[PDB]
Design a protein around this ligand. Structure first.
Ligand SMILES: Nc1ncnc2c1ncn2[C@@H]1O[C@H](COP(=O)(O)OP(=O)(O)OP(=O)(O)O)[C@@H](O)[C@H]1O
Ligand SMILES: Nc1ncnc2c1ncn2[C@@H]1O[C@H](COP(=O)(O)OP(=O)(O)OP(=O)(O)O)[C@@H](O)[C@H]1O
Ligand SMILES: Nc1ncnc2c1ncn2[C@@H]1O[C@H](COP(=O)(O)OP(=O)(O)OP(=O)(O)O)[C@@H](O)[C@H]1O
Ligand SMILES: Nc1ncnc2c1ncn2[C@@H]1O[C@H](COP(=O)(O)OP(=O)(O)OP(=O)(O)O)[C@@H](O)[C@H]1O
Ligand SMILES: Nc1ncnc2c1ncn2[C@@H]1O[C@H](COP(=O)(O)OP(=O)(O)OP(=O)(O)O)[C@@H](O)[C@H]1O
Lengths: 362, 362, 362, 362, 362
DNA sequence: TTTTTTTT
């Protein structure tokens, strides 16, 4: 009798494993009897204990195969092919739908029976989120939908604001919920051609603060950014496809993704200003600085800039109807838990602790 | 009959051998009758003499095969696969506990009946090391915990200061203890691709005497070191995953390992300086040299570079409860052996001899 | 009937051959009847005529095979594996002891019945080198010890002197004796990657006339030498492992071997001066030149730059007890043969002639 | 029935062919019925017409093979393997002897009945060459001895003179005589890596028209050559092996060949001047020009470039004793043939014509 | 039943195809029923309709093969092998004779019954070209012989004159007639290396439009080319071999091919002037311009660009004895066609019209 | 796939 290549391929699909070594390693673990399997008994890892008993007979024969890496290479191809199909076929909303469902799986397990971070800390995370600026959940929801629609011109917001104003901290966090990258335009125009290639295939993008050419009138350093960006008419508009470039590599073309421009409190051409839907001046805030100094568990469990923290803020504020239609069930199922475990008073109290800069958990 | 690839792969696992040439050479030694094997008789290498009798029959049949490198390739991939599975599943504490078991097994041999090392010399090494900086064991205990907790923007400590001030000496001992990697960045910005590629699946990394720009007024030549350092601060923050390269293999994404950086008293952008929890500056002391000059077996046997010396130091200084739980059995067993073999007065004799700059053994 | 891959592998072990083309070429020669083999009758190459009769029967079947390069590849891998195993398990003293046995075997051939070398001419070379510096044989013993002990950051010797000072000549003989490699560093800082990759598993290295800067004041055209080397301080220090690269191969990690650097009298950053444990200064001396002019067979046979000549010097000058215990047997036979073949008065007649700058022989 | 790979290997060996495509295309020609082969019947190519009839039957079966390029690859390997065996085992004298045997075979064809060459035209070339420098044939003999002996730091000859003075003409003939390669060092310092790679296994090399810097007073266009070349001083000296590189290939290690440097009349750094064992001035002369204008069949047939011309000069001038012992038999036969063809008066008449600047013939 | 690899190789040989994909695609088309094949019925492409009926049976089995690309590779190799045999063995006269046969085959189609060309319009082309220079037909015949004999120094021709005076038109037709490549030497000196790499194995080269320096007074834009050419003396004189490079390939060594240089009226150094056999002056002539206006089917169909036009000019003007002896039989048949198709009065009326600057046809 | 080319 012989290895079923089919069963190996199922496991790769189910785990969504797409590293051949990782697939090989884990599947070999099943070769011992599941009947006594201590990893199963300890319930350490679902990717093991959910599967061992089913795969056991096949894994034994797999361990005797002389061909093992070849089996795994085909299985990894299957998962990569699946991704490339979906990546071409599906809508931006379907794509965001799936990423929500993915992060809602981390929501599921992180506070599952292992509880390996206390959900309450993430409530305090939500508190130090929603303090930041007016209606912060709605400002998120608005900018999120703006980026899903990817409507031409209506695509770029201007995060003005000085040093440590938090703009980078927030925009970086949002890319967990979506994926993307940040960019540089202060490096001179000969380099810029290659800098632009970093935007390729990004679901979202962001820009570094312009060291704007005029900013040293404000004593804000003047790299090439302002005149560079003011000249890049289409890229912001996303009206048509454009070419993009990388070292040692050929050109490619697509519509240039939507995004964010951050800056310090720079001077700007009215033409470049006309490229933006919004401008906001972020600022450091005197409660918030001391509150973080007093609330550092939010940094320790890596809460603050997690998409999971944005996801909770979103789940807490936003109506079920505002979410991806089928996932709305899962949204109810978490509105259940979050409002079950946490009163509005502790939530309000936590926000009031920020409202006085005292440490959030109290 | 035919080769058991299974028996080959077991040896590769139990040696934890992960080089295909090394494995091939090793296994071919077993083709002779262990009945006369001089290496067995000499008890020359455990990786041989423990296994020769068991594998002899299979090695004879292996010696005739025409597939020999292919057999070894599959066996090596099994070992790499095991590492990759541990890499993602284990806690950083669990990793460290494994690492310590490996070192303890080696010490069991080194000071065993084979006994090629004598612990008095290594204890003199401990004395020299604990003399090198105040409360050395305690500063080590801090670094270990910091490295296990892996707190972002706090993942790195920097050593500054003149040559021959021991920063390398200490880095070497810690790196052996942790099983990290050294890395270089004083290099073409592009070629960092595979260099950082080595950071795949490592607990810890070290960057050596990396070059500032300016300070050549003090005979410190400018170089790409500090450029590449103050660039890549995300790798020092560690809040961010990076995709890492190897030849003829996929790129793989992970959080970059935490680490140590070292320099002489170069220039350093404050933007980079922000990343380091401790930034300690190392400077020479001469009585150490006079001791070394009189104690040169310390350097000749590289004792003061070994992580083994640090582990001996931690056994001597730290409470049993400060160790990870499972090994505390072995900790106690070694504390017995140390405190049995050495009075404190012997350790005093050593340590004042060190401080006095006289030969430690006396 | 079929090819024995085993017999091929033995021949590669026997010859220590490790180029697949050289292996293939030489094994093919055995296809003709050794009974008639003109090369055997000439007794021209030992690696042929020792083996032809044994391998003839298998070579006839190899000559028909369709796999030939594959059979040779496996054999070369077996030899390379043996090197890897030895490199990881021998003491440096055993490695050197093996190297000396190989040279002694060549000497047995050279001065054997085939006797192509004249031991008088070779001993004249010993007199010339023993004259080149004070206490020459003592200096060689010091260097050997230093390379065997391999004390970290006490690992490199610097040779300085004007052109035709003889520093290259001395370095060449030492390099043959220990079997290192020479390397160039007066080079662009990128391709150093594959250049230094040659040092993998080598016992010793030499860097040549390494170009400094500001040298035109002394008519030394400046270059990248000193610039590059004061980067690689760790490679000199040998305090930690480093990663070495080859084409189509992933990096190998190991300590970088000890060695020698040669220098016309450029400037030196003391960051670099710190790492040479010793420097020797060389001077042109015209009477040696007159001797060479009258004694051209020294150069034509390259005698004065062969490690064979250094070995003969050591046999003449050093106690038998200084040699590693096993070869002391062979050493005694060569001491006897030398004392038989030369009176001291003949050697004194030579050293006198060398001092006079007359042709060595009279 | 099946293809004899052995017969293909024989054909490759006998034709000394080492291009897989040329070997393939050649062997395929034999598949047509030998008895009609117009290439045979017109006696156009010895590499065809000697072999077609022998190889015919196997060529027909080879034409049907599904495996054709694999068969050719194996055959080409054995030809390459033989070259490497020879490179490591022949004396430099034997190499030159073999090279001479090959040219002498070509001369048997050129002046055969099938031979198109006019021996009188080729002998006219020798007259022109013997005029180009004093004691021309003695100079050739001295150069040959120098190349055979390959004495370190006494290995390189420098040619200089005005443009149109004869220098590359003479270099070309020596290079065809000995075999070797020309190289251009007036380059950026990076691609020197692959440029110098060409020297692998070569006997001679020639550096072509190395450019100095300054001396544009003498209308000399400046370039990298001299300053660049002075960095490679050890490649000239040849005291020690060096490492050489080809595209997509690992570094080879060997001693860098001896050879010739050509330039117009720049000045030379005496670090490099010291390395030239001999220097030859070339000067324009009117009678050579006027003779050559009236003797253009010399140029039209490339006579004065070609190694056959230098070989003919040596056969005329040098004693039989000076040739390596085995070729003395063929040398004697060629001497008889030449003396039978040309009286001394005819040769002296030619020389007098050249001196008079009339066309060589009369 | 089996695929015949032989029948594929015959098709590849007969089509002279040497792209695997082009070979593959065309063979697959034959799998459909030849008897109704629409492409056959249209007589659309000779590479198809001549062959479909023959290969149909094998194409059907080929369509089921699992080895398809492997079969094609071996076939394409056979075509490439034929080219290298030819390149190394044919005389330059035979090369040209082959090239003419290819053009004559295309003309048989073009002016066939299926032939879409009009022999009258193509003869109008010849009338215009014969007016472009005095003695045009003799000038071509001289150029061809100069290329065939390839006599050193006597190798290169210079085309000179104002912009829009036809020089590149004539170069292009000659380049099509002989086969060859254009090259641009106006580059900086570094990239010239890969540029000249294009010349490998070519028959002719054209140096397009080399820019001088100065003559900006005459509005001529300056550039490197003239200086670069003056630095390539040996490539032009073609007396000795040179090394040539391609991307990702090792160098090859050959005589650099003969060719043409073209320029506007820059000043030419005498060093460069001496390199050229012949200079041809091109001048604008209004009557050609007004003729082209009223005869633009010449331009539209690219008639005056084509080597096919020049071949017709040779056939009309040259005696049959001037052609290579084998093709003289075809030449007579084409002369016979042309004599039947045009009286001299018809042709001379066209020449008169061109001299009037009137449209060619009346 | 890298290496080489590109990049610089
Ligand atoms: N309101 C705030 N007041 C003070 N500190 C803050 C505030 N918000 C965030 N921070 C802290 O400051 C860090 C830096 O913030 P961030 O980089 O996002 O600011 P920035 O405005 O984009 O800065 P810069 O203009 O200097 O690039 C944050 O990661 C957080 O630790
Ligand atoms: N504080 C010290 N006092 C005296 N000797 C020291 C001291 N620290 C190190 N050494 C000696 O200096 C030599 C090198 O030590 P080490 O490489 O660790 O220093 P370093 O400061 O890291 O040097 P570098 O800057 O060259 O890397 C060793 O011989 C070591 O014993
Ligand atoms: N001390 C000496 N006195 C005189 N002649 C010497 C001396 N040493 C070497 N020679 C001569 O100089 C030649 C070259 O010697 P060597 O290459 O070893 O010198 P070097 O100083 O290392 O030179 P370089 O800097 O050119 O590499 C020797 O072959 C010998 O002919
Ligand atoms: N000594 C000479 N006197 C006169 N004419 C010469 C002389 N030597 C060569 N010639 C002519 O000069 C032509 C070019 O010679 P050669 O190819 O050796 O050129 P070069 O300028 O001397 O060398 P290079 O190009 O290497 O600098 C010869 O083909 C011949 O026509
Ligand atoms: N002798 C001529 N007299 C007038 N017009 C001409 C002549 N030769 C060419 N033409 C016109 O010039 C146009 C371009 O010709 P062509 O491209 O050969 O010119 P060129 O001067 O050789 O160009 P370039 O130097 O830019 O490559 C032709 O299409 C035709 O219209």
């Amino acid at each position: 009798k012989q290895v079923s290549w089919k069963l190996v391929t199922e496991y790769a699909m189910e785990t969504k494993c797409d590293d051949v070594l990782l697939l090989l390693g884990m599947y070999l673990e099943f070769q011992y009897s599941f009947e006594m399997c201590l990893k199963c008994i300890k319930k350490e890892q679902p990717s093991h204990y959910k599967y061992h008993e089913k795969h056991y007979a096949n894994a034994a024969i797999f361990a005797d195969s002389k061909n093992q890496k070849t089996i795994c290479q085909q299985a990894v191809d299957t998962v990569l092919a699946k991704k490339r199909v979906d990546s071409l076929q599906l809508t931006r909303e379907q794509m965001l739908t799936n990423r929500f469902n993915d992060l809602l799986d981390r929501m599921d397990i992180m506070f599952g029976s292992t509880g390996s971070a206390d959900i309450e800390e993430w409530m305090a995370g939500v508190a130090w989120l929603h303090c930041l600026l007016p209606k912060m959940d709605s400002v998120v929801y608005d900018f999120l939908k703006c980026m899903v629609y990817n409507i031409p011109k209506k695509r770029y917001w201007l995060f003005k604001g000085p040093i440590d104003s938090g703009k980078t901290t927030l925009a970086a966090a949002l890319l967990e919920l979506c994926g993307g990258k940040a960019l540089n335009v202060n490096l001179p125009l000969d380099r810029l051609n290659f800098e632009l290639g970093v935007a390729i295939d990004q679901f979202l993008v962001v820009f570094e603060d312009v060291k704007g050419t005029g900013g040293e009138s404000r004593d804000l350093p003047s790299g090439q950014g302002i005149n560079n960006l003011d000249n890049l008419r289409d890229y912001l508009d996303g009206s048509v496809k454009v070419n993009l470039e990388k070292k040692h590599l050929n050109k490619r073309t697509q519509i240039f993704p939507p995004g964010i421009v951050t800056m310090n409190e720079y001077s700007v051409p009215k033409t470049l200003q006309a490229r933006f839907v919004k401008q906001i001046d972020f600022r450091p805030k005197d409660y918030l600085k001391h509150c973080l100094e007093r609330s550092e568990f939010l940094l320790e469990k890596r809460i603050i800039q997690s998409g999971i923290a944005l996801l909770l803020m979103l789940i807490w504020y936003r109506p079920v109807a505002e979410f991806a239609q089928s996932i709305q069930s899962r949204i109810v199922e978490w509105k259940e838990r979050l409002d079950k475990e946490f009163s509005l008073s502790v939530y309000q109290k936590m926000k009031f602790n920020v409202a006085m800069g005292i440490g959030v958990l109290d």
